Amino acid sequence: GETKVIYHLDEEETPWLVKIPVPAERITLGDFKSVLQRPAGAKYFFKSMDQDFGVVKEEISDDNARLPSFNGRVVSWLVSS
Amino acid sequence: GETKVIYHLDEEETPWLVKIPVPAERITLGDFKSVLQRPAGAKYFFKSMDQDFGVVKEEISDDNARLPSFNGRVVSWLVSS
Amino acid sequence: GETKVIYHLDEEETPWLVKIPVPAERITLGDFKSVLQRPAGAKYFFKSMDQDFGVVKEEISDDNARLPSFNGRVVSWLVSS
Amino acid sequence: GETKVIYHLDEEETPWLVKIPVPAERITLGDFKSVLQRPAGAKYFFKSMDQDFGVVKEEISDDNARLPSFNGRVVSWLVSS
Amino acid sequence: GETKVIYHLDEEETPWLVKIPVPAERITLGDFKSVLQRPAGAKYFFKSMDQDFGVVKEEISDDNARLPSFNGRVVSWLVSS
Amino acid sequence: GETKVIYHLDEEETPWLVKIPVPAERITLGDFKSVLQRPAGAKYFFKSMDQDFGVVKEEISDDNARLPSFNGRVVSWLVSS
């Protein structure tokens, strides 16, 4: 199983792409943070869905929390402290 | 207790969603600002009600002020300086 | 003393509400502009009265000019350049 | 010298009021358009008089043309394209 | 055959340029690491393309993996541990 | 003819300066290495230009290769093995 994570770092226009050997059905914030060099201090937002608002960027801070995905892809924005 | 805050940053079309572990009955602007990386300099507006105008976006600048909410959800627009 | 200003931005349906700590008897366009993030370039119109026409939207461009109000409330429309 | 211009925008019931620092004896369509944010594309009509019809709304398209007025007041209807 | 590799080291503004005597069609991460003094501990990202996102910086960790290139040039960012 | 070579040794902040009695138009990596006490094992990078990237640090490993210079000055970074 493999998940592609496309992530943006602060205001940088060019996104980063990492492939994590965990299937998207199981992938957690901790799995993502494990592949980042400096996971600390940042807030993590993920492309997700809200009933009223449609597409939103949802903050997830718990390493055990599952990440939202579409067709095996997670899209994230990092905001550094 | 938990409050969902859906917020817009300036003219960005896609909203952000954060969950704050304070019940909506007690949630304050300071509680919201505490979860933002850079709370300073911005003005904060919240979906609210006016007697004559109905739905409005109400500016709240005092950290001790309670935020308007509906069914545990706050909707906010941030305008940066 | 406090004045409530309900204002519309261009064609946006949902109005904004700000409370300004100046009594309505003294409030000026400059007082209003001081609480806007980007006061420049816009024209400001205020709910007012004309002898022949009744309710009108009156343009006020001078920061020292007093704003028309009713029961401590000013209603304004902003038109951006 | 000052001219008051009361103008209606398409079918909007509430008129707008602007004061232009040109005396009514000299005021031209261009003077009026100079104070509008988006003068283009619209047709401009002004309260005027016809010999047979009495009060009419007269179209004026030339910026150098003088505007009809009564006691320092011009009344106009704008029709957008 | 020769490949030019332009690489950035952490946050250093000035890039480094190395020429590797392997044609770009065959060049692998291991070929690049072989010319670095201290290849260990770092993560390696390469200018690449994603179907939805366009230009991205793609992490490649396997020495046997081919590097993306354009006209014989590879562009890389190194992030140290 | 004389070339000034300003060089940095690994992470040492303070650069070294040597003057080599060869004109900059002809100076080669071998000429530089001849004035170093321990030229072996190190990689040598030189301030240079790339069409797309502008200023870069270009690795040169061949003793017969000419060094890039500006106004008779070469700037180099050494990385030890």
Subunit partners of chain C (3 or more CB pairs within 8 A):
B, D
| Cα dist from D31 to C58, D34, D56, whole Å | 18, 5, 22
Calpha distance F80→F38 (Å, rounded):
10
Calpha distance A74→A68 (Å, rounded):
6
- Across the interface, which of C56, C59, C80 has its CB nearest the CB of D14? C56
CB C26 within 8 A of CB C66: yes
Q: Which residue has the tokens 């205001």?
A: A11
CB proximity list for E36: less than 8 A, separation 6 or greater: none
Minimal C-alpha gap between B29 and chain A (Å) = 18
Calpha distance F56→E19 (Å, rounded):
13
The beta strands (E) that lie in A24-67 are given as 43-50, 54-59
CB F68 within 8 A of CB F74: yes
| Cα dist from E43 to A49, B34, E8, whole Å | 32, 33, 12
The enclosing domain of F13 has a CATH number of: 2.40.240.130
| Residues shown for chain A | 81
Calpha distance F39→D71 (Å, rounded):
95
Q: How many domains does chain C have?
A: 1
For residue A33, the surrounding DSSP H or E stretch is helix A29-33
- Pick left, alpha or beta for residue D56 (phi over 0 → left; psi -120 to 50 → alpha; otherwise beta): beta
Task: List chain D residues with CB under 8 Å of C55.
Answer: 14
Contact F57 E6 (CB under 8 A): no
Alpha helices (H) along chain F: 29-33
CB proximity list for F41: less than 8 A, separation 6 or greater: F80, F81
CB proximity list for A60: less than 8 A, separation 6 or greater: A29, A44, A45, A46, A67
Contact F57 E16 (CB under 8 A): yes
Q: Residue C22 has which token pair? A: 């100046």
- Across the interface, which of D17, D35, D37 has its CB nearest the CB of C50? D17
Calpha distance C79→C9 (Å, rounded):
7
Reference B57, options B44, B42, B38; nearest CA is B44
- Across the interface, which of B43, B56, B79 has its CB nearest the CB of C6? B56
Q: Residue A65 has which token pair? A: 């929390």
β-partners of residue C79 are: C43
Task: List chain C residues with CB under 8 Å of B53.
Answer: 6, 15, 17
Which amino acid, C75? V
Domain of residue B14, residue span: 1-81
* Resolution (Å units): 1.6
Q: Residue F35 has which token pair? A: 């004035």
Calpha distance F63→F60 (Å, rounded):
8
CB C20 within 8 A of CB C76: no
Which amino acid, E74? V
Calpha distance B29→B68 (Å, rounded):
10
Contact C57 D16 (CB under 8 A): yes
- In degrees, to the nearest 5, what angle opens at C-alpha A54 toward C-alphas A48 and A60? 25
For residue F77, the surrounding DSSP H or E stretch is strand F73-79
Task: Tell me the DSSP string of B5-60.
Answer: EEEEETT-SS-EEEEESS-TTT-BHHHHHTTSS--SS-EEEEEEEETTTEEEEEE-
